[PDB]
Design an enzyme around this catalytic site. Structure first.
Site, PDB file in Angstrom:
ATOM      1  N   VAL A  58       0.781  -1.230   0.000  1.00 29.18           N
ATOM      2  CA  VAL A  58       0.000   0.000   0.000  1.00 29.18           C
ATOM      3  C   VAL A  58       0.819   1.290   0.000  1.00 29.18           C
ATOM      4  O   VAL A  58       1.734   1.462   0.799  1.00 29.18           O
ATOM      5  CB  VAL A  58      -0.960  -0.005   1.187  1.00 29.18           C
ATOM      6  N   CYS A  59       0.459   2.192  -0.905  1.00 30.24           N
ATOM      7  CA  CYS A  59       1.147   3.459  -1.016  1.00 30.24           C
ATOM      8  C   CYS A  59       0.116   4.574  -1.075  1.00 30.24           C
ATOM      9  O   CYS A  59      -0.174   5.141  -2.142  1.00 30.24           O
ATOM     10  N   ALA A  60      -0.422   4.912   0.089  1.00 29.30           N
ATOM     11  CA  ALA A  60      -1.434   5.952   0.167  1.00 29.30           C
ATOM     12  C   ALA A  60      -1.090   7.149  -0.702  1.00 29.30           C
ATOM     13  O   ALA A  60       0.042   7.626  -0.698  1.00 29.30           O
ATOM     14  CB  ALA A  60      -1.616   6.386   1.601  1.00 29.30           C
TER      15      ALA A  60
END
Ligand SMILES: [N+]
Ligand SMILES: [N+]
Ligand SMILES: [Y+3]
Ligand SMILES: [Y+3]
Ligand SMILES: [Y+3]
Length: 160
Positions: A58-60
């Site tokens: 995950v890479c907001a």
């Protein structure tokens, strides 16, 4: 076994470096197992984007957006964590740096002192001005709080 629950309040081993003073020296480890020395960034603004772990698929957008704006302001962005170099290539002039074998966490007062995450670095932001002095710091006080990206960017813009 009993579970070591995670408290809401973040408790680190020390104090973040004072704003206006020379940033503490550091010798982090890079992806090639070489050293990422603070002397390597002399004359350049640096954003230390510190995380308990960057080992997530995950890479907001909030993180990517911030890193891109920071890099756009002319700063070198280091995503610092206790993950080994091998695991840092999985996250999102922007590069990962590992504190697995150096004193960065204690020197910057960000190592988590208790709880299930003890020994990892707390979510925090430290901006080092091109002049070498700490320009801004934020140790996020609670576990589920998002960093104040706006304030960090204003400090970054001010010391490019
Ligand atoms: N990994
Ligand atoms: N504790
Ligand atoms: Y204090
Ligand atoms: Y040196
Ligand atoms: Y609260």
């Amino acid at each position: 076994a009993q579970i070591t629950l995670r408290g809401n309040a973040i408790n680190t081993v020390g104090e973040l470096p004072a704003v206006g003073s020379p940033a503490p020296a550091f010798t982090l480890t890079g992806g090639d197992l070489g050293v990422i020395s603070s002397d390597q960034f002399r004359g350049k603004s640096v954003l230390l984007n510190i995380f308990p772990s960057v080992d997530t698929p995950v890479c907001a957008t909030s993180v990517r957006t911030f890193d891109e704006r920071a890099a756009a302001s002319g700063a070198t962005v280091l995503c610092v964590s206790k993950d080994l170099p091998f695991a840092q290539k999985r996250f999102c002039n922007v590069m990962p740096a590992s504190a697995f074998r150096d004193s960065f966490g204690e020197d910057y007062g960000v190592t988590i002192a208790d709880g299930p995450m003890a020994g990892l670095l707390a979510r925090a932001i430290v901006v080092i001005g091109a002049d070498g002095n700490v320009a801004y710091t934020e140790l996020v006080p609670e576990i589920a709080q998002e960093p104040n990206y706006e304030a960090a960017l204003a400090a970054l813009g001010a010391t490019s």
